[PDB]
């Protein structure tokens, strides 16, 4: 169930990057976007290899270049290919090598105040980094699409017994009821907030659409990195800021770290109506995405196991749902 194989990746790497890899293992996942990851090692340097297919090939590297250019070291820059490129397109898939980084992500590695400040500084460097007109005309933009809200509302009349349902699809069906009220409150609120917000395409900055503890690699002491730049966007800073104290992953939910963060980001003016909105909409979408996954055709077997898992966590103590409803500064 793995694309390339042993000596095959090695041959690929050596052909397009002129690197001599002796070992090249396959990793079970990482950040799935039709992208498999491998840890290829050279006589002295380890590399993180990524192969993209379907919802993979795009143009986000237009940002990491813009960001590297802007001078943000807290980003993992791609290894150039012999044709002097940052990737290697191959009829079937795309190759994107990175220097390998061993560093627990934020879900198993907390940040030191210092690091919390450093993150705040970077998120700011980024939020400030000017975006070329030609780049803006690409980046998706905050529209407040009810896409997600609507998909969730669909489920409502779809929760009931149907022998055509197995164990898993069942627990979910039930967990959904058991929390029926809370969920409607997320849709009806995300919607309500949606109306109270007067858009302003001028206060929109470059944002890492989904910057949670899962995408901060916490290294030695300054070696923090903000990974996953597949779907960056242009939105009010609150699109990113909502994660600080947001509780995603059941971490990043300790009020005192928020202070540390704004220290580096430099305390400014945050729209709490917008901040609150994102915390709600995000959960909606998650419910939407996970929902579909657990309703329809059990064809997505071995996946739906996790969807359900994450789905439930959202409701655990001091997790994203608790925090959203506890609308605090
Ligand atoms: N996360 C612990 C250490 N390495 S890793 O496989 O998870 C990993 C995940 C995601 C990205 Cl983008 C990477 C980039 C470079 N090295 C390791 C990377
Ligand atoms: Ni550099």
Numbering used by the authors: 3 to 331
Please quote the authors directly:
For aminoglycosides, a group of antibiotics used to treat serious nosocomial infections, the main mechanism of resistance is via the enzymatic inactivation of the drug by acetyltransferases, nucleotidyltransferases, or phosphotransferases. Among the three types of aminoglycoside-modifying enzymes, aminoglycoside phosphotransferases or kinases (APHs) yield the highest levels of resistance thereby providing a rationale for focusing inhibitor development for these specific resistance factors. Combined, these studies reveal that although members of the APH family share low similarities in sequence and their ligand specificity varies greatly, their overall three-dimensional fold is homologous to each other and to that of ePKs. To further examine the suitability of the CKI-7 scaffold for inhibitor development, we determined the crystal structures of APH(3′)-IIIa and APH(9)-Ia in complex with CKI-7.
APH(9)-Ia is an atypical APH which phosphorylates only one aminoglycoside, spectinomycin, that is distinct from the other aminoglycoside antibiotics. Paralleling the APH(3′)-IIIa result, CKI-7 was found to inhibit APH(9)-Ia (Ki = 159±11 µM) in a competitive fashion with respect to ATP, although 2.5 times less effectively. The CKI-7-bound APH(9)-Ia complex was crystallized in space group P3121 with one molecule per asymmetric unit. This structure has been refined to 2.9 Å and a final Rcryst and Rfree of 0.222 and 0.279, respectively. For APH(9)-Ia, this same loop (residues 28–34) also adopts a different conformation in the APH(9)-Ia-CKI-7 structure compared to the nucleotide-bound state. In fact, the conformation observed is comparable to what is observed for APH(3′)-IIIa, i.e. the tip of loop in the CKI-7-bound APH(9)-Ia also dips into the phosphate-binding area of the nucleotide binding pocket. Intriguingly, despite the conserved nature of this residue, the aromatic side chain of Tyr42 of APH(3′)-IIIa points toward the linker region of the protein whereas the side chain of Phe50 in APH(9)-Ia points in the opposite direction toward the ribose- and phosphate-binding pockets. In APH(9)-Ia, the aminoethyl group of the inhibitor is positioned in the entrance pocket or the solvent-exposed side of the adenine-binding pocket and it points back at itself forming an intramolecular interaction with the equatorial sulfonyl oxygen atom (O2S). The inhibitor also makes a second interaction with the linker region of APH(9)-Ia via the Nβ of the aminoethyl tail and the main chain carbonyl of Ile103. As a result, the orientation and conformation of CKI-7 observed in APH(9)-Ia mirrors what is seen in CK1.
